[PDB]
Write a protein that binds this ligand. Structure first.
Ligand SMILES: CC(C)[C@H](N)C(=O)OP(=O)(O)OC[C@H]1O[C@@H](n2cnc3c(N)ncnc32)[C@H](O)[C@@H]1O
Ligand SMILES: [Zn+2]
Length: 918
């Protein structure tokens, strides 16, 4: 046996990753040695890159969605660092708001107690966010991500709360913060106003009723008919107490039925078929002639003005809209257009209050009843004025944290105005809506489709309600001047409060008196001021991160505008939008240059992950099972810009991708492990096959890099895998196995192959470093030849090398053209397959080939096809137009197993020299 006499060609780099054991040691090392602060400190940094982290809410353990987010940021940041740039990536945490406070509220009820005290209540919220900020930081680090995680930004930091307030101050001083009174989203479960980003639309069952409002005697007499009752359709009988008007479409025909029901003519066929009204039409009237008629509410006998709405629809309902200014936005403006009462007797908990008694809007038995529980009895009380009751299902707004359905209540709140012109920094005049639309156009969106998703929301969004009635957050810390009943926006007062917030935090706004919150110039008039006690929308907190992080640290944590932000698709409704609006107020532009949007983590069915249905695949279990580098590769190897379905069969296919990458690196390290390192200093004479591989390596390297530049990691990884699978393993390593294992260690041709393998292993390490960082760190740990070839202590010294300069290749060396011999190789391998089907021969080495086109260099044909002989022989095997196969007229060599030995069981001529070399 000659197996002892072959080159060993082994490496300590193991085949099995054993990731759940080795990865924790790597990530713990990067924290001990401060790898990120070392990345920033790299002395040859050239250029700058800023990724501004969007702060996840400081609540709960991380799920797979958080991991997808951070891993994608980690790939983008590591890509820029390995391109040679100074990077800025300070992660942050969203600590205020209902995402944290609602958990305190739910914990207190399960604990059977409560908490009136403001300071102590904010403390338990603050401690909850601190506890889960630290839990999430360590779970992020167990994914291999690198950022300033030991110095993250926190909205609960005193300096940060002061930065948020100073951002609000800028909004106020530009004339965009104004009080408004109108119906808005109201969550009775937390007794607070809401805006769109705090609202979740989902399907809900609801009553759907058609109600008859009889015309009063004088209106019947003015219309000259015996009976007439306008029919309204509504899904909210809880608002009927607050009716003041019935709205019709302007200049539209309304049909009067023989039973005396008045509806829009365009809808009579639907309503008659529904059995709401009868089928016979006696008269038709124009809605213009019906305006200012008066009807009688059948619920409380109150008057109802027949009015004309701006856009009454004739596709649904009846063409007659029950109008309640207290509980509808378009209802409110119509009530003001006709100067009607704003009836609103629903308190902050969604229950009828004493206003129904004083204004006789509803029977006293409804006092204290919740509006949704009272609807069954209201419908019964409608009597025979109820023409038809159905139950339907419609999309309905719910509170994002209490998950209860919201209502609308006419209330006075604070708003950022969208269509109010304000003075631009360049001296011009524009509305916030116009500025945001122009700022969107300067932002690159990845994918491009996310642009008009944000553009559409900006085109249609209303004024932004900022004021909330909760405790955990940054207060709208302004004083109302009782003398003028306006807010005080004088700079000395606002900066005095801001300085106090910066040193002490926002707790002082609840604790201190009015005079102690006022500057010295103002205490003599302390009696004339009252504190606003609303807190800011938590989406204003996160929308201000660019100012608190990028601007207030003067580029020490990144430049404003940032180069890249990267969040999930639900952030067009949220952080993307709130940051755009706040950035457009302060700087008149978006605080980001590029938006990368990724999809959501969904189950095997494509359904949303819920902590209830159990479709949640826990991140911890996923990491223990597959390892972080496989989860990272699963992210990069999949269509992250769309939703990602989680199934263990998809991670198995990813492990096969990781095994293939890892097995390839093990072969490379094993087959240049014995190369004398003074080979690195001298130029080599590379073969045609060597140059084909070096030129192919250069071609796919440009493709992988160009794809990774566009963040299309699937495309680049496919180019990498196909190269690894076809050109590298299938062709090159197959043809070099004889020289690597059977030629002398001193053979210049074997040494040249090892340089090619060394170059290939360098390129794979560079391109895989941002994705499989622990694995590439492991590779460099096990190869002294790789560490000296790349001049790298570890993975963080990786640079994109020039293969030409480090291998001393000639300029204007004409590229190889293997289009002919590779097609002959394909044709031979097909014919070789069928000869093995018959069982004639077992290997390519048993064959001799005579090619009919002598243009093909003989020894390259022998190398690529791994025939033992090129030319004529005795025993024909089969023939094609291109070649003839013969049985190799030699014995199999006992050492290299090639058919090149002239005598049985005797080493071939090459192996004899090697076996006796001194
Ligand atoms: C200021 C913002 C960031 C706000 N604090 C917030 O929403 O913070 P939040 O903690 O809710 O999320 C923070 C980030 O995680 C992503 N995200 C959440 N659920 C996901 C899911 N099922 N699949 C994939 N990504 C998911 C989400 O888009 C965001 O980029
Ligand atoms: Zn041999």
């Amino acid at each position: 046996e000659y197996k002892d006499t072959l080159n060993l060609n082994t490496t300590t780099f193991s085949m099995k990753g054993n990731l759940s054991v080795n990865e924790p040691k790597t990530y713990a090392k990067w924290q001990e040695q401060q790898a990120f602060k070392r990345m920033q400190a790299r002395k040859d940094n050239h250029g700058d890159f800023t990724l501004h982290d969007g702060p996840p809410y400081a609540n709960g353990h991380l799920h797979l969605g958080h991991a997808l987010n951070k891993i994608l940021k980690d790939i983008v940041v590591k890509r820029e660092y390995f391109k040679g740039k100074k990077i800025y990536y300070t992660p942050g945490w969203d600590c205020h708001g209902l995402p944290i406070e609602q958990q305190i509220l739910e914990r207190l009820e399960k604990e059977k107690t409560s908490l009136e005290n403001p300071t102590l209540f904010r403390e338990k919220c603050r401690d909850h966010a601190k506890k889960f900020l630290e839990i999430q930081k360590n779970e992020f680090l167990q994914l291999g991500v690198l950022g300033d995680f030991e110095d993250p930004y926190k909205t609960m930091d005193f300096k940060f709360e002061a930065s948020i307030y100073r951002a609000l101050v800028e909004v106020a001083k530009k004339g965009l913060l104004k009080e408004r009174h109108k119906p808005i989203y109201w969550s009775y479960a937390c007794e607070s106003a809401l805006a769109e980003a705090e609202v979740e639309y989902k399907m809900k069952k609801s009553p759907s009723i058609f109600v008859a409002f009889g015309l009063k005697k004088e209106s019947l007499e003015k219309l000259k008919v015996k009976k007439a009752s306008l029919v309204i359709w509504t899904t909210t009988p809880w608002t009927l107490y607050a009716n003041v008007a019935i709205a019709l479409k302007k200049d539209a025909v309304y049909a009067l039925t023989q039973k005396g029901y008045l509806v829009a003519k365009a809808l009579h066929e639907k309503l008659a078929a529904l059995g709401v009204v009868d089928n016979e039409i006696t008269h038709e009237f124009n809605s213009n002639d019906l305006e200012y008629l008066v009807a009688t509410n059948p619920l409380n006998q109150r008057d109802s003005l027949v009015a004309l709405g701006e856009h009454v629809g004739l596709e649904d309902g009846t063409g007659a809209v029950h109008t309640a200014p207290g509980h509808g936005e378009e209802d409110y403006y119509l009530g003001l257009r006709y100067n009607l009462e704003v009836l609103m007797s629903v308190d902050e908990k969604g229950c009828y209050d004493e206003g129904i008694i004083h204004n006789q809007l509803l029977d006293e038995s409804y006092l204290g009843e919740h509006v949704f529980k009272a609807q069954k009895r209201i419908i019964e009380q409608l009597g025979d004025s109820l023409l038809l009751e159905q139950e339907i299902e419609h999309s309905y707004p719910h509170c994002w944290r209490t998950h209860k359905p919201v209502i609308y209540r006419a209330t006075t709140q604070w708003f950022i105005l969208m269509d109010e012109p304000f003075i631009q920094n360049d001296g011009s005049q524009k509305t916030l809506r116009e500025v945001a639309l122009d700022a969107i156009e300067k932002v690159e969106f990845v994918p491009s489709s996310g642009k008009n998703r944000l553009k559409t929301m900006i085109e249609n969004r209303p004024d932004w309600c900022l004021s909330r009635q909760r405790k955990w957050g940054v207060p709208l810390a302004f004083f109302i001047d009782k003398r003028t009943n306006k807010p005080c926006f004088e700079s000395e007062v606002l900066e005095h409060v801001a300085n106090l917030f910066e040193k002490k935090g926002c707790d002082v706004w609840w604790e201190y008196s009015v005079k102690d919150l006022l500057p010295p110039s103002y205490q003599e008039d302390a009696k004339h001021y009252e504190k606003i006690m609303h807190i800011l929308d938590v989406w204003f907190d996160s929308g201000s991160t660019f100012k608190a992080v990028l601007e207030d640290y003067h580029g020490e944590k990144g430049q404003s505008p940032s180069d890249v932000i990267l969040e999930g698709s639900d952030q067009h409704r949220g952080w993307f939008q709130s940051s755009l609006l706040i950035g457009c107020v302060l700087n008149n532009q978006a605080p980001f240059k590029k938006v990368i949007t990724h999809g959501f983590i969904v189950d095997e069915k494509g359904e949303k992950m819920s902590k209830s249905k159990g479709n949640v695949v826990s991140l911890d279990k996923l990491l223990k099972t597959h390892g972080s580098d496989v989860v990272r590769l699963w992210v990069a190897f999949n269509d992250y810009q769309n939703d990602l379905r989680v199934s263990q069969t998809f991670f198995t296919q990813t492990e096969q991708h990781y095994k293939k990458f890892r097995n390839t690196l093990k072969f490379l390290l094993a087959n240049f492990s014995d190369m004398d390192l003074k080979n690195l200093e001298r130029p080599h004479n590379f073969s045609p096959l060597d140059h084909f591989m070096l030129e192919t390596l250069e071609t796919i390297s440009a493709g992988v890099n160009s794809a990774f530049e566009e963040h299309d990691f699937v495309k680049g990884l496919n180019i990498l895998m196909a190269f690894v699978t076809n050109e590298l393993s299938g062709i090159y390593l197959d043809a070099c196995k004889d020289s690597l294992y059977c030629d002398s260690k001193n053979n210049e041709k074997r040494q040249a192959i090892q340089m090619v393998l060394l170059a290939t292993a360098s390129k794979l390490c560079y391109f895989l470093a941002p994705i499989l960082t622990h694995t590439i760190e492991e590779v460099l740990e096990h190869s002294q030849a790789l560490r000296i070839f790349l001049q790298a202590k570890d993975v963080f010294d990786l640079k994109d090398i020039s293969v030409s300069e480090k291998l001393h290749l000639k300029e204007f060396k004409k590229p190889e053209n293997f289009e002919a011999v590779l097609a002959l190789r394909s044709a031979f391998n097909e014919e070789l397959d069928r000869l093995k089907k018959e069982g004639v021969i077992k290997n390519s080495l048993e064959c001799a080939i005579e090619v009919k086109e002598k243009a093909l260099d003989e020894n390259l044909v022998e190398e690529l096809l791994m025939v033992s002989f090129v030319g004529i022989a005795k025993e024909k095997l089969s023939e094609t137009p291109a070649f003839t196969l013969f049985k190799a007229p030699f014995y199999k060599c006992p050492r290299c197993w090639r058919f090149k030995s002239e005598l049985e069981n005797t080493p071939c001529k090459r192996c004899e020299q090697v076996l006796k070399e001194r």
